[PDB]
């Protein structure tokens, strides 16, 4: 992808995340299971709510009609409603299919940030206490319970509480 | 090894397709359709009120009184006029209806 | 053929349904229609990449 | 600009039946911003039954309306239909549709538009 | 979880000008994940604070929202004759839109 999260690293997706687009799989003592992130999913849906309302909203119901026949004289006229017509449909054709080809693009490379942006904030927020093992994963290097895998996640993470018990480990090795 | 936390996105079961500026059929979670492809193949009530049929005779035989377009849609209100391909009863006695095209629209 | 259905757009070919801004059944409408294209599919992208297990 | 939501007008049903009430807006057609349905007894509180987001296509409902609810849109038109099967008197409230958006675009956890309500009535 | 919205007090008199503070709480901690709303007697409720403090448009400024986590808050810095009514507040944060269970303003006599 563009930002090489989908795709990228991350190979594949969950089919049991079924509460929300972007989202965590813990696996501690206490049990494993898949969890979604609030703040990247409902912010998601209302972009990709507002990038589909803006271009829907303006295309309007038109009142159509089949008009006046063009008699024998009025051929002049009749070829420059077919002029008009087969003109406004041609620009309208290419308009649409170009800008569902352009956007949809944008559309993949915007779940590609997002779920990038999700991956930095968990890496900076561990540093040292955990090690990237690939595919979007954390070996943590301390114990993790259940409140420390929330607090991750909550954005609301202590480096320093873990810090020494992760340290052993780390020299450890 | 110990305990471990993952980064991921969402799957699911849909079979839906879209087309980018450089990737063909393209597998998406979700999408919505901008197109209408389907018609229920029958002439319906414009606006609740039925529209006026005609059959092989046209309209011009219809408001002048061809013998052919006598037994047919004597109704008193339609949304639009139908008429067949096939039409070809009407002005027998041969000339040119003045105006004609003007009164289909004034009878529509 | 005429049948007793109701519409609020009616075409030649048949009546269709104005729940999509978009049409391709044909240019000849009466009432208030979608906007006639020649596209034969337009469809937004809304989700991720579809990826299953590989 | 100055949408307004209207519903379908009061319907009285026999209890164990199945009702549809509509949701229509007004304006700009075509539009795809998340839709709810919350019902209110008479002199009890706000209750959130289920609601729409036509982005993903389904819809999701409260514990208690899983089987009885049914949330449709009418594609993108903007028009949103509620069902409730199986009525019973305690179901007797006024139903109202909101559109979920604020002035700061789509909003999908707010209810920036109301319905005018609709209220159903159950008894033999 | 499921949350659950409790607000304090659930019935409140004041005068026409006196400060008017209405406080929500929650079952766990949901951030700004909350809005607010007035229902008057006999029509359709409407939406007055969302994300606990961005003001609806349209709203006057009297209605001041506030609290982060699990405490949040509603202030009228002065009352006036048509702020009489009940006010709800409901959160954004899980898939059941749980309610308060609401709070109505009196006249003073």
């Known amino acids: 992808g563009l930002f090489g999260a989908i795709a990228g690293f991350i190979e594949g997706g969950w089919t049991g995340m079924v509460d929300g687009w972007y989202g965590y799989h813990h696996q501690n003592e206490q049990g494993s299971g898949y969890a979604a992130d609030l703040k990247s999913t409902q912010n998601a849906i209302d972009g990709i709510t507002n990038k589909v309302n803006s271009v829907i909203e303006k295309m309007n119901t038109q009142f159509t009609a089949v008009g006046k026949e063009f008699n024998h004289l009025e051929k002049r006229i009749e070829n420059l409603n077919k002029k008009v017509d087969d003109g406004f449909l041609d620009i309208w054709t290419y308009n649409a299919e170009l800008l569902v080809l352009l956007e949809n693009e944008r559309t993949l490379d915007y779940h590609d940030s997002n779920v990038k942006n999700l991956y930095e904030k968990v890496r900076s927020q561990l540093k040292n206490n955990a090690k990237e093992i690939g595919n979007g994963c954390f070996e943590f290097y301390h114990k993790c319970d259940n409140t420390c895998m929330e607090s991750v996640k909550n954005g609301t993470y202590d480096y320093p509480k873990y810090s020494e018990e992760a340290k052993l480990n780390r020299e450890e090795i | 090894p110990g305990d471990t936390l993952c980064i991921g996105y969402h799957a699911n079961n849909s079979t839906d397709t879209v087309d980018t500026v450089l990737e063909k059929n393209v597998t998406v979670t979700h999408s919505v359709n901008l197109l209408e492809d389907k018609h229920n193949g029958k002439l319906c009530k414009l606006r609740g009120v039925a529209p006026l049929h005609l059959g092989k005779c046209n309209i011009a035989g219809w408001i002048l009184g061809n013998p052919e377009c006598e037994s047919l849609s004597t109704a008193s209100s339609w949304s639009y006029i139908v008429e067949t391909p096939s039409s070809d009863n009407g002005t027998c006695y041969p000339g040119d209806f003045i105006d004609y095209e003007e009164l289909r629209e004034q009878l529509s | 053929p005429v049948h007793d259905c109701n519409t609020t757009c009616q075409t030649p070919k048949g009546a269709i349904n104005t729940s999509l801004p978009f049409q391709n059944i044909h240019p000849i409408t009466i009432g208030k229609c979608p906007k006639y294209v020649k596209s034969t599919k337009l469809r937004l992208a809304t989700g991720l990449r579809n990826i299953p297990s590989i | 600009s100055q949408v307004q939501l209207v519903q379908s007008g009061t319907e009285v049903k026999k209890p164990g039946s199945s009702v549809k009430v509509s949701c229509k807006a007004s304006?700009?057609?075509?539009?795809?911003?998340?839709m709810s349905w919350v019902r209110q007894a008479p002199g009890q509180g706000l209750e959130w039954m289920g609601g729409?987001?036509?982005?993903?296509?389904?819809?999701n409902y409260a514990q208690k309306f899983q089987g009885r609810l049914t949330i449709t849109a009418d594609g993108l038109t903007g028009t949103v239909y509620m069902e409730l099967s199986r009525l019973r008197s305690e179901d007797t409230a006024v139903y109202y549709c909101?559109?979920?958006?604020?002035?700061?675009?789509?909003?999908?956890?707010?209810?920036?538009?109301w319905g005018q309500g609709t209220m159903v009535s159950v008894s033999a | 979880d499921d949350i659950q919205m409790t607000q304090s007090p659930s019935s409140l008199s004041a005068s026409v000008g006196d400060r008017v503070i209405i406080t929500c709480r929650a079952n766990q901690s949901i951030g700004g994940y909350l809005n607010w709303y007035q229902q008057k007697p006999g029509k359709a409720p409407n939406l007055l604070i969302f994300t606990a403090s961005t003001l609806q448009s349209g709203v006057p400024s009297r209605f001041s929202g506030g609290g982060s986590g699990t405490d949040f808050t509603l202030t009228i810095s002065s009352l006036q004759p048509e702020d009489f009514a009940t006010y709800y507040c409901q959160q954004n944060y899980n898939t059941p839109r749980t309610f308060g269970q609401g709070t109505k303003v009196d006249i003073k006599r």
């Open positions: 304006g700009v057609t075509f539009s795809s911003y998340a």
């Open positions: 729409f987001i036509p982005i993903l296509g389904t819809a």
């Open positions: 909101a559109r979920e958006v604020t002035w700061k675009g789509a909003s999908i956890g707010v209810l920036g538009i």
